[PDB]
Amino acid sequence: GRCAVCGDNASCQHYGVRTCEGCKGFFKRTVQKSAKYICLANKDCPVDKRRRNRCQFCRFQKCLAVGMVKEVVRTDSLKGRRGRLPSKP
DNA sequence: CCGAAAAGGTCATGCG
DNA sequence: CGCATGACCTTTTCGG
Ligand SMILES: [Zn+2]
Ligand SMILES: [Zn+2]
């Protein structure tokens, strides 16, 4: 695979990291809802394409480990805003 | 021009 | 049934 989080297939960048649509949305919803997870085990559950949903905390933990930027998740004035932002005058 | 990039929108799906 | 997941879509811009 190519997803730096679960290992699934990935075609491009998401919140700074090569991720799959799965991890893509997970990171998003989490950051929007500001969800707070808790690990039942010992914060080191297996995060791969097959067991990525067994534990949330751990999946988000890795999302950050590989550097997904929480700041890139549009909010406020940018909430609901799609596509690429403008960079040129 | 045009399509690669990538952020949010959409439900069908399914397990709980 | 109720909510979470994720395959696929539409939206914006800009780089080749
Ligand atoms: Zn993944
Ligand atoms: Zn865990």
CSV table of N, CA and C (backbone and C1' of nucleotides) and ligand atoms in Angstrom, one decimal:
chain,number,residue,atom,x,y,z
A,1,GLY,N,0.8,-1.2,0.0
A,1,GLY,CA,0.0,0.0,0.0
A,1,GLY,C,0.8,1.3,0.0
A,2,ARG,N,0.2,2.4,0.0
A,2,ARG,CA,0.9,3.7,0.0
A,2,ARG,C,0.4,4.6,1.1
A,3,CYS,N,-0.8,4.3,1.8
A,3,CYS,CA,-1.3,5.1,2.9
A,3,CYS,C,-0.3,5.0,4.0
A,4,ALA,N,0.2,6.1,4.5
A,4,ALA,CA,1.2,6.1,5.6
A,4,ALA,C,0.5,5.8,6.9
A,5,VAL,N,-0.8,5.6,6.9
A,5,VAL,CA,-1.5,5.3,8.2
A,5,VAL,C,-1.9,3.9,8.3
A,6,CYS,N,-2.8,3.5,7.5
A,6,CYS,CA,-3.3,2.1,7.5
A,6,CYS,C,-2.6,1.2,6.5
A,7,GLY,N,-2.1,1.9,5.5
A,7,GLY,CA,-1.4,1.1,4.5
A,7,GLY,C,-2.3,0.9,3.2
A,8,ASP,N,-3.5,1.3,3.3
A,8,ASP,CA,-4.4,1.1,2.2
A,8,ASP,C,-3.8,1.8,1.0
A,9,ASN,N,-4.5,1.8,-0.2
A,9,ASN,CA,-4.1,2.5,-1.4
A,9,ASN,C,-4.3,4.0,-1.3
A,10,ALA,N,-3.4,4.8,-1.8
A,10,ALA,CA,-3.5,6.2,-1.7
A,10,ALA,C,-3.1,6.8,-3.1
A,11,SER,N,-3.8,7.9,-3.5
A,11,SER,CA,-3.5,8.5,-4.8
A,11,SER,C,-2.9,9.9,-4.6
A,12,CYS,N,-3.1,10.5,-3.5
A,12,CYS,CA,-2.6,11.9,-3.3
A,12,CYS,C,-2.5,12.3,-1.8
A,13,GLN,N,-2.2,13.5,-1.5
A,13,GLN,CA,-2.0,14.0,-0.2
A,13,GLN,C,-3.3,14.4,0.5
A,14,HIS,N,-3.4,14.3,1.8
A,14,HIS,CA,-4.6,14.7,2.6
A,14,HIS,C,-4.1,15.2,4.0
A,15,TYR,N,-4.4,16.5,4.2
A,15,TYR,CA,-4.0,17.1,5.5
A,15,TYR,C,-2.5,16.9,5.7
A,16,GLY,N,-1.7,17.1,4.6
A,16,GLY,CA,-0.2,17.0,4.7
A,16,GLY,C,0.4,15.6,4.4
A,17,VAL,N,-0.4,14.6,4.5
A,17,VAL,CA,0.1,13.2,4.3
A,17,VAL,C,-0.5,12.3,3.3
A,18,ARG,N,0.3,11.5,2.6
A,18,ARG,CA,-0.2,10.5,1.6
A,18,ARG,C,-1.1,9.6,2.4
A,19,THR,N,-2.4,9.8,2.2
A,19,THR,CA,-3.4,8.9,2.8
A,19,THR,C,-4.5,8.5,1.9
A,20,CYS,N,-5.3,7.5,2.4
A,20,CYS,CA,-6.4,6.9,1.7
A,20,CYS,C,-7.6,7.6,2.1
A,21,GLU,N,-8.7,7.4,1.3
A,21,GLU,CA,-10.0,8.0,1.6
A,21,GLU,C,-10.5,7.6,2.9
A,22,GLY,N,-10.1,6.4,3.4
A,22,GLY,CA,-10.5,6.0,4.7
A,22,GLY,C,-10.0,6.9,5.7
A,23,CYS,N,-8.7,6.9,5.9
A,23,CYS,CA,-8.0,7.8,6.9
A,23,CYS,C,-8.3,9.2,6.6
A,24,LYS,N,-8.5,9.6,5.3
A,24,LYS,CA,-8.8,10.9,4.9
A,24,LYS,C,-10.0,11.4,5.8
A,25,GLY,N,-11.2,10.9,5.6
A,25,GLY,CA,-12.3,11.3,6.3
A,25,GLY,C,-12.3,11.1,7.8
A,26,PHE,N,-11.6,10.1,8.3
A,26,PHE,CA,-11.5,9.8,9.7
A,26,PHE,C,-10.9,11.0,10.3
A,27,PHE,N,-9.7,11.5,9.8
A,27,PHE,CA,-9.0,12.6,10.3
A,27,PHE,C,-9.9,13.8,10.3
A,28,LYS,N,-10.6,14.0,9.2
A,28,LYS,CA,-11.5,15.2,9.0
A,28,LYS,C,-12.6,15.2,10.1
A,29,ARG,N,-13.5,14.2,10.0
A,29,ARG,CA,-14.6,14.2,11.0
A,29,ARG,C,-14.1,14.4,12.4
A,30,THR,N,-13.0,13.7,12.8
A,30,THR,CA,-12.4,13.8,14.1
A,30,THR,C,-12.1,15.2,14.4
A,31,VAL,N,-11.3,15.9,13.6
A,31,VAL,CA,-11.0,17.2,13.8
A,31,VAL,C,-12.1,18.2,13.8
A,32,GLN,N,-13.1,18.0,12.9
A,32,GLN,CA,-14.3,18.9,12.9
A,32,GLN,C,-15.0,18.7,14.3
A,33,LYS,N,-15.5,17.5,14.5
A,33,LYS,CA,-16.3,17.3,15.7
A,33,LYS,C,-15.4,17.4,16.9
A,34,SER,N,-14.1,17.6,16.8
A,34,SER,CA,-13.2,17.7,17.9
A,34,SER,C,-13.3,16.5,18.8
A,35,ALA,N,-13.6,15.4,18.2
A,35,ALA,CA,-13.8,14.2,19.0
A,35,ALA,C,-12.6,13.8,19.8
A,36,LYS,N,-12.9,13.2,21.0
A,36,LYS,CA,-11.8,12.8,21.9
A,36,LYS,C,-12.0,11.3,22.1
A,37,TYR,N,-11.0,10.5,21.7
A,37,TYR,CA,-11.0,9.1,21.8
A,37,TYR,C,-10.3,8.6,23.0
A,38,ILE,N,-10.5,7.3,23.3
A,38,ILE,CA,-9.8,6.7,24.4
A,38,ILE,C,-9.5,5.2,24.0
A,39,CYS,N,-8.3,4.8,24.3
A,39,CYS,CA,-7.9,3.5,24.0
A,39,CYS,C,-8.1,2.5,25.1
A,40,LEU,N,-8.9,1.4,24.7
A,40,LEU,CA,-9.2,0.4,25.7
A,40,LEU,C,-8.0,-0.4,26.1
A,41,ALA,N,-7.1,-0.7,25.1
A,41,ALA,CA,-5.9,-1.4,25.3
A,41,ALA,C,-4.8,-0.6,25.9
A,42,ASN,N,-3.6,-0.5,25.3
A,42,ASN,CA,-2.5,0.3,25.8
A,42,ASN,C,-2.0,1.2,24.8
A,43,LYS,N,-2.8,1.9,24.1
A,43,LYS,CA,-2.4,2.9,23.1
A,43,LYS,C,-1.4,2.5,22.0
A,44,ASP,N,-1.6,1.2,21.6
A,44,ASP,CA,-0.6,0.7,20.6
A,44,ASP,C,-1.2,-0.3,19.7
A,45,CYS,N,-2.6,-0.3,19.6
A,45,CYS,CA,-3.3,-1.2,18.8
A,45,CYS,C,-2.8,-1.2,17.3
A,46,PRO,N,-3.0,-2.4,16.6
A,46,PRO,CA,-2.6,-2.5,15.3
A,46,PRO,C,-3.4,-1.6,14.3
A,47,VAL,N,-2.7,-0.7,13.6
A,47,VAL,CA,-3.3,0.2,12.6
A,47,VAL,C,-2.9,-0.2,11.2
A,48,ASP,N,-3.8,-1.0,10.6
A,48,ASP,CA,-3.5,-1.4,9.2
A,48,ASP,C,-4.8,-1.4,8.5
A,49,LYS,N,-4.9,-1.7,7.2
A,49,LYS,CA,-6.1,-1.6,6.5
A,49,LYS,C,-7.2,-2.5,7.0
A,50,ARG,N,-6.9,-3.6,7.7
A,50,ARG,CA,-7.9,-4.5,8.2
A,50,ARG,C,-8.4,-4.2,9.6
A,51,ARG,N,-7.6,-3.7,10.5
A,51,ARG,CA,-7.9,-3.4,11.9
A,51,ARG,C,-7.9,-2.0,12.2
A,52,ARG,N,-8.0,-1.1,11.2
A,52,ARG,CA,-8.0,0.4,11.5
A,52,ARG,C,-9.2,0.9,12.2
A,53,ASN,N,-10.3,0.1,12.1
A,53,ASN,CA,-11.6,0.6,12.8
A,53,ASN,C,-11.8,-0.1,14.1
A,54,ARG,N,-11.0,-1.0,14.5
A,54,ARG,CA,-11.1,-1.7,15.8
A,54,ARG,C,-10.9,-0.7,16.9
A,55,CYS,N,-10.0,0.3,16.8
A,55,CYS,CA,-9.7,1.3,17.7
A,55,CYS,C,-9.5,2.7,17.1
A,56,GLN,N,-10.3,3.7,17.6
A,56,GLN,CA,-10.2,5.0,17.0
A,56,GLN,C,-8.9,5.8,17.5
A,57,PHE,N,-8.9,5.9,18.8
A,57,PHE,CA,-7.7,6.6,19.4
A,57,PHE,C,-6.4,6.3,18.7
A,58,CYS,N,-6.1,5.1,18.6
A,58,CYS,CA,-4.9,4.6,18.0
A,58,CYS,C,-4.7,5.1,16.5
A,59,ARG,N,-5.8,5.1,15.8
A,59,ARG,CA,-5.8,5.5,14.4
A,59,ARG,C,-5.5,6.9,14.3
A,60,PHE,N,-6.1,7.7,15.2
A,60,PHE,CA,-5.9,9.2,15.2
A,60,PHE,C,-4.5,9.4,15.6
A,61,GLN,N,-4.0,8.7,16.6
A,61,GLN,CA,-2.7,8.8,17.2
A,61,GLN,C,-1.7,8.7,16.0
A,62,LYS,N,-1.9,7.7,15.2
A,62,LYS,CA,-0.9,7.5,14.1
A,62,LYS,C,-1.1,8.6,13.1
A,63,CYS,N,-2.3,9.0,12.8
A,63,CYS,CA,-2.6,10.1,11.9
A,63,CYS,C,-1.7,11.3,12.2
A,64,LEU,N,-1.5,11.6,13.5
A,64,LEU,CA,-0.7,12.7,13.9
A,64,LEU,C,0.8,12.3,13.8
A,65,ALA,N,1.1,11.0,14.2
A,65,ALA,CA,2.4,10.6,14.2
A,65,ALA,C,3.0,10.8,12.8
A,66,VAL,N,2.3,10.4,11.8
A,66,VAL,CA,2.8,10.6,10.4
A,66,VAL,C,2.6,12.0,10.0
A,67,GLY,N,2.2,12.9,10.9
A,67,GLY,CA,2.0,14.3,10.6
A,67,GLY,C,0.8,14.9,9.8
A,68,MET,N,-0.4,14.5,10.1
A,68,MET,CA,-1.5,15.0,9.4
A,68,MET,C,-1.8,16.4,10.1
A,69,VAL,N,-2.0,17.4,9.3
A,69,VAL,CA,-2.2,18.7,9.9
A,69,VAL,C,-3.7,19.0,10.2
A,70,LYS,N,-4.0,19.2,11.5
A,70,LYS,CA,-5.3,19.5,12.0
A,70,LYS,C,-5.8,20.8,11.5
A,71,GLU,N,-4.8,21.7,11.3
A,71,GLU,CA,-5.0,23.1,10.8
A,71,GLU,C,-5.6,23.1,9.4
A,72,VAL,N,-5.3,22.1,8.6
A,72,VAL,CA,-5.7,22.1,7.2
A,72,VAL,C,-7.2,21.7,7.1
A,73,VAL,N,-7.8,21.3,8.2
A,73,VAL,CA,-9.2,21.0,8.2
A,73,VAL,C,-10.0,22.3,8.3
A,74,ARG,N,-10.5,22.8,7.1
A,74,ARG,CA,-11.2,24.0,7.1
A,74,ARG,C,-12.2,24.1,8.3
A,75,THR,N,-12.4,25.4,8.8
A,75,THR,CA,-13.3,25.7,9.8
A,75,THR,C,-13.7,27.1,9.7
A,76,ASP,N,-14.6,27.6,10.6
A,76,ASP,CA,-15.1,28.9,10.6
A,76,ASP,C,-15.4,29.4,9.2
A,77,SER,N,-14.9,30.6,8.9
A,77,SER,CA,-15.2,31.2,7.6
A,77,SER,C,-14.9,30.2,6.4
A,78,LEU,N,-14.0,29.3,6.7
A,78,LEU,CA,-13.7,28.3,5.7
A,78,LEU,C,-14.5,27.0,5.7
A,79,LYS,N,-15.4,26.9,6.7
A,79,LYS,CA,-16.3,25.8,6.8
A,79,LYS,C,-17.2,25.6,5.6
A,80,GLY,N,-17.2,24.4,5.0
A,80,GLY,CA,-18.1,24.2,3.8
A,80,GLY,C,-17.4,24.5,2.5
A,81,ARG,N,-16.3,25.2,2.6
A,81,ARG,CA,-15.5,25.7,1.5
A,81,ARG,C,-14.8,24.5,0.8
A,82,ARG,N,-15.0,24.3,-0.5
A,82,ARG,CA,-14.3,23.2,-1.2
A,82,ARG,C,-13.2,23.7,-2.0
A,83,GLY,N,-12.6,22.7,-2.7
A,83,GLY,CA,-11.5,23.0,-3.6
A,83,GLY,C,-10.3,23.7,-3.1
A,84,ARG,N,-9.4,24.0,-4.0
A,84,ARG,CA,-8.1,24.7,-3.6
A,84,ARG,C,-8.4,26.1,-3.3
A,85,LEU,N,-7.6,26.6,-2.3
A,85,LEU,CA,-7.7,28.0,-1.9
A,85,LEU,C,-6.8,28.8,-2.9
A,86,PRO,N,-7.0,30.1,-3.0
A,86,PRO,CA,-6.3,31.0,-3.9
A,86,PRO,C,-4.9,31.4,-3.4
A,87,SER,N,-3.9,31.4,-4.2
A,87,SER,CA,-2.6,31.8,-3.8
A,87,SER,C,-2.0,33.0,-4.6
A,88,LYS,N,-2.6,33.2,-5.8
A,88,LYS,CA,-2.1,34.3,-6.7
A,88,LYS,C,-3.0,35.5,-6.8
A,89,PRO,N,-2.5,36.7,-6.7
A,89,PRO,CA,-3.2,38.0,-6.8
A,89,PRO,C,-4.0,38.0,-8.1
B,1,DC,O5',-8.1,29.0,-23.7
B,1,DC,C5',-8.8,27.8,-23.3
B,1,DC,C4',-8.1,26.5,-23.6
B,1,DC,C3',-8.8,25.3,-23.0
B,1,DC,O3',-8.6,24.1,-23.9
B,1,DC,C1',-6.6,25.4,-22.1
B,2,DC,P,-9.2,22.7,-23.5
B,2,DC,O5',-8.0,21.8,-23.2
B,2,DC,C5',-7.0,22.2,-22.2
B,2,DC,C4',-6.6,21.0,-21.3
B,2,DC,C3',-7.8,20.2,-20.7
B,2,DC,O3',-7.4,18.9,-20.4
B,2,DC,C1',-6.6,21.3,-19.0
B,3,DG,P,-8.4,17.8,-19.8
B,3,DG,O5',-7.5,16.9,-19.0
B,3,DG,C5',-6.1,16.8,-19.2
B,3,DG,C4',-5.3,17.0,-17.9
B,3,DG,C3',-5.8,16.0,-16.8
B,3,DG,O3',-4.6,15.7,-16.0
B,3,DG,C1',-6.0,18.2,-16.1
B,4,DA,P,-4.6,14.4,-15.1
B,4,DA,O5',-3.7,14.7,-13.9
B,4,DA,C5',-2.4,15.1,-14.1
B,4,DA,C4',-1.9,15.9,-12.9
B,4,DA,C3',-1.9,15.2,-11.5
B,4,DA,O3',-0.8,15.7,-10.7
B,4,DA,C1',-3.3,17.1,-11.5
B,5,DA,P,-0.5,15.0,-9.4
B,5,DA,O5',-0.8,16.1,-8.3
B,5,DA,C5',-2.0,16.9,-8.4
B,5,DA,C4',-2.2,17.8,-7.2
B,5,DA,C3',-2.4,17.1,-5.9
B,5,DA,O3',-1.8,17.8,-4.8
B,5,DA,C1',-4.4,18.2,-6.6
B,6,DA,P,-1.9,17.2,-3.3
B,6,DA,O5',-3.4,17.7,-2.9
B,6,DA,C5',-3.6,19.0,-2.3
B,6,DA,C4',-5.1,19.1,-1.9
B,6,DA,C3',-5.5,18.0,-0.9
B,6,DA,O3',-6.4,18.6,0.0
B,6,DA,C1',-7.0,18.1,-2.7
B,7,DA,P,-6.0,19.0,1.5
B,7,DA,O5',-7.3,19.6,2.1
B,7,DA,C5',-7.6,21.0,1.8
B,7,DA,C4',-9.1,21.1,1.6
B,7,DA,C3',-10.0,20.3,2.6
B,7,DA,O3',-11.1,21.0,3.2
B,7,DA,C1',-10.7,20.1,0.3
B,8,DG,P,-11.9,20.3,4.3
B,8,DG,O5',-13.5,20.4,3.8
B,8,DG,C5',-14.0,21.6,3.4
B,8,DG,C4',-15.2,21.3,2.5
B,8,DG,C3',-16.3,20.5,3.2
B,8,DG,O3',-17.6,21.0,2.8
B,8,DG,C1',-15.6,19.4,1.3
B,9,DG,P,-19.0,20.2,3.2
B,9,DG,O5',-19.3,19.3,1.9
B,9,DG,C5',-19.8,19.9,0.7
B,9,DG,C4',-20.6,19.0,-0.1
B,9,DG,C3',-21.8,18.4,0.7
B,9,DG,O3',-22.9,18.2,-0.1
B,9,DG,C1',-20.3,16.7,-0.1
B,10,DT,P,-24.2,17.4,0.4
B,10,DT,O5',-23.8,15.9,-0.1
B,10,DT,C5',-23.7,15.6,-1.4
B,10,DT,C4',-23.7,14.1,-1.7
B,10,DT,C3',-24.9,13.3,-1.0
B,10,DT,O3',-25.4,12.3,-1.9
B,10,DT,C1',-22.8,12.3,-0.5
B,11,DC,P,-26.9,12.0,-1.9
B,11,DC,O5',-27.2,11.7,-0.4
B,11,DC,C5',-27.8,10.4,0.0
B,11,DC,C4',-27.0,9.3,-0.5
B,11,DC,C3',-27.4,8.0,0.3
B,11,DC,O3',-27.2,6.9,-0.6
B,11,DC,C1',-25.1,8.6,0.8
B,12,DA,P,-28.4,5.9,-0.9
B,12,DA,O5',-27.7,4.5,-1.1
B,12,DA,C5',-26.8,4.3,-2.2
B,12,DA,C4',-25.7,3.3,-1.8
B,12,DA,C3',-26.3,2.1,-1.2
B,12,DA,O3',-25.6,0.9,-1.6
B,12,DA,C1',-25.0,3.2,0.5
B,13,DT,P,-25.9,-0.5,-0.9
B,13,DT,O5',-24.9,-0.4,0.4
B,13,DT,C5',-23.5,-0.3,0.3
B,13,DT,C4',-22.9,-0.7,1.6
B,13,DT,C3',-23.6,-1.9,2.2
B,13,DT,O3',-22.6,-2.8,2.7
B,13,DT,C1',-23.5,-0.1,3.7
B,14,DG,P,-23.0,-4.3,3.0
B,14,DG,O5',-22.6,-4.4,4.6
B,14,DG,C5',-21.4,-3.9,5.1
B,14,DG,C4',-21.6,-3.6,6.6
B,14,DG,C3',-22.4,-4.7,7.3
B,14,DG,O3',-21.8,-5.0,8.6
B,14,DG,C1',-23.3,-2.6,7.8
B,15,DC,P,-21.3,-6.4,8.9
B,15,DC,O5',-20.0,-6.2,9.8
B,15,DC,C5',-19.6,-4.9,10.1
B,15,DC,C4',-20.0,-4.5,11.5
B,15,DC,C3',-20.7,-5.6,12.3
B,15,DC,O3',-20.0,-5.8,13.6
B,15,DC,C1',-21.9,-3.6,12.4
B,16,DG,P,-20.8,-6.4,14.8
B,16,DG,O5',-21.1,-5.2,15.8
B,16,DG,C5',-20.1,-4.1,15.8
B,16,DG,C4',-20.8,-2.8,16.2
B,16,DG,C3',-21.3,-2.8,17.7
B,16,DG,O3',-21.3,-1.5,18.1
B,16,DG,C1',-23.1,-2.5,16.2
C,1,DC,O5',-37.0,2.4,12.7
C,1,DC,C5',-35.9,1.5,13.2
C,1,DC,C4',-35.0,2.3,14.2
C,1,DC,C3',-34.4,3.6,13.6
C,1,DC,O3',-34.2,4.5,14.7
C,1,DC,C1',-32.7,2.0,14.1
C,2,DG,P,-33.2,5.7,14.5
C,2,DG,O5',-31.8,5.1,15.0
C,2,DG,C5',-31.5,5.2,16.4
C,2,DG,C4',-30.0,5.7,16.5
C,2,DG,C3',-29.8,7.0,15.8
C,2,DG,O3',-28.8,7.8,16.4
C,2,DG,C1',-28.6,5.3,14.7
C,3,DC,P,-28.2,9.1,15.7
C,3,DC,O5',-26.7,8.7,15.5
C,3,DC,C5',-26.0,7.9,16.4
C,3,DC,C4',-24.7,7.4,15.8
C,3,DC,C3',-23.8,8.4,15.1
C,3,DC,O3',-22.4,8.1,15.5
C,3,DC,C1',-24.2,6.6,13.6
C,4,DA,P,-21.2,8.9,14.8
C,4,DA,O5',-20.4,7.8,14.0
C,4,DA,C5',-19.9,6.7,14.7
C,4,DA,C4',-19.1,5.8,13.8
C,4,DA,C3',-18.0,6.6,13.0
C,4,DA,O3',-16.8,5.8,13.0
C,4,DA,C1',-19.6,5.7,11.5
C,5,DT,P,-15.5,6.3,12.2
C,5,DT,O5',-15.6,5.5,10.8
C,5,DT,C5',-15.7,4.1,10.8
C,5,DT,C4',-15.9,3.5,9.4
C,5,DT,C3',-14.8,4.0,8.4
C,5,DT,O3',-14.2,2.9,7.7
C,5,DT,C1',-17.0,4.3,7.6
C,6,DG,P,-12.9,3.2,6.8
C,6,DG,O5',-13.5,3.5,5.4
C,6,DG,C5',-14.3,2.5,4.8
C,6,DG,C4',-14.7,3.0,3.4
C,6,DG,C3',-13.6,3.6,2.6
C,6,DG,O3',-13.9,3.3,1.2
C,6,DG,C1',-15.3,5.2,2.8
C,7,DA,P,-12.8,2.7,0.3
C,7,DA,O5',-13.5,2.6,-1.1
C,7,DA,C5',-14.8,1.9,-1.2
C,7,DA,C4',-15.7,2.5,-2.3
C,7,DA,C3',-14.9,3.0,-3.6
C,7,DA,O3',-15.7,2.7,-4.7
C,7,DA,C1',-15.9,4.9,-2.5
C,8,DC,P,-15.3,3.3,-6.1
C,8,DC,O5',-16.0,4.7,-6.1
C,8,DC,C5',-17.4,4.8,-6.0
C,8,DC,C4',-17.9,6.2,-6.3
C,8,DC,C3',-17.2,6.9,-7.5
C,8,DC,O3',-18.2,7.5,-8.2
C,8,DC,C1',-17.1,8.2,-5.6
C,9,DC,P,-17.8,8.6,-9.4
C,9,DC,O5',-18.3,10.0,-8.8
C,9,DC,C5',-19.6,10.1,-8.2
C,9,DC,C4',-19.9,11.5,-7.8
C,9,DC,C3',-19.5,12.5,-8.8
C,9,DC,O3',-20.5,13.6,-8.9
C,9,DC,C1',-18.5,13.0,-6.7
C,10,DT,P,-20.4,14.7,-10.0
C,10,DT,O5',-20.1,16.0,-9.2
C,10,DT,C5',-21.0,16.4,-8.2
C,10,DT,C4',-20.5,17.6,-7.5
C,10,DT,C3',-20.1,18.8,-8.4
C,10,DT,O3',-20.4,20.0,-7.8
C,10,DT,C1',-18.2,18.2,-7.2
C,11,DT,P,-20.3,21.4,-8.6
C,11,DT,O5',-19.2,22.1,-7.7
C,11,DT,C5',-19.3,22.2,-6.3
C,11,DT,C4',-18.0,22.7,-5.7
C,11,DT,C3',-17.3,23.9,-6.4
C,11,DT,O3',-16.9,24.8,-5.3
C,11,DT,C1',-15.8,22.2,-6.2
C,12,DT,P,-17.3,26.3,-5.4
C,12,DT,O5',-15.9,27.0,-5.8
C,12,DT,C5',-14.9,26.1,-6.4
C,12,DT,C4',-13.5,26.5,-5.8
C,12,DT,C3',-12.8,27.6,-6.6
C,12,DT,O3',-12.0,28.4,-5.8
C,12,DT,C1',-11.7,25.5,-6.8
C,13,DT,P,-11.6,29.9,-6.2
C,13,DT,O5',-10.1,29.7,-6.6
C,13,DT,C5',-9.6,28.4,-7.0
C,13,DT,C4',-8.1,28.3,-6.7
C,13,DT,C3',-7.3,29.2,-7.7
C,13,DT,O3',-6.1,29.6,-7.0
C,13,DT,C1',-7.0,26.9,-8.3
C,14,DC,P,-5.0,30.5,-7.8
C,14,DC,O5',-4.0,29.4,-8.4
C,14,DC,C5',-3.4,28.5,-7.5
C,14,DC,C4',-2.5,27.5,-8.3
C,14,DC,C3',-1.5,28.1,-9.2
C,14,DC,O3',-0.4,27.2,-9.3
C,14,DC,C1',-3.0,26.8,-10.5
C,15,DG,P,1.1,27.8,-9.3
C,15,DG,O5',1.9,26.6,-9.9
C,15,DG,C5',1.9,25.3,-9.4
C,15,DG,C4',2.0,24.3,-10.5
C,15,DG,C3',3.1,24.5,-11.5
C,15,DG,O3',3.6,23.2,-11.9
C,15,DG,C1',1.1,24.6,-12.7
C,16,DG,P,5.0,23.1,-12.7
C,16,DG,O5',4.7,22.4,-14.1
C,16,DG,C5',4.0,21.1,-14.1
C,16,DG,C4',3.6,20.8,-15.5
C,16,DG,C3',4.7,21.0,-16.6
C,16,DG,O3',4.6,20.1,-17.6
C,16,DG,C1',2.9,22.4,-17.0
D,1,ZN,ZN,-5.4,4.6,5.7
D,2,ZN,ZN,-6.0,1.6,21.0
